């Protein structure tokens, strides 16, 4: 279980919290919080 250290990550997630290199893989963990179904947007 070694997770902890990070460099440098121009992409960090606001809701929940987190880090990443590059946009996309921002992207996909940003999906966990925005519509979490996948009945379209919940909202709109
Ligand atoms: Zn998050």
Request: with cysteine; charged share 15%; aromatic share 6%.
């Amino acid at each position: 279980g070694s997770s902890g250290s990070s460099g440098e990550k121009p992409y960090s997630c606001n809701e929940c919290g987190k880090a990443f290199t590059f946009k996309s893989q921002l992207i996909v963990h940003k999906g966990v919080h925005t519509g979490v179904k996948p009945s379209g947007p919940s909202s709109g």
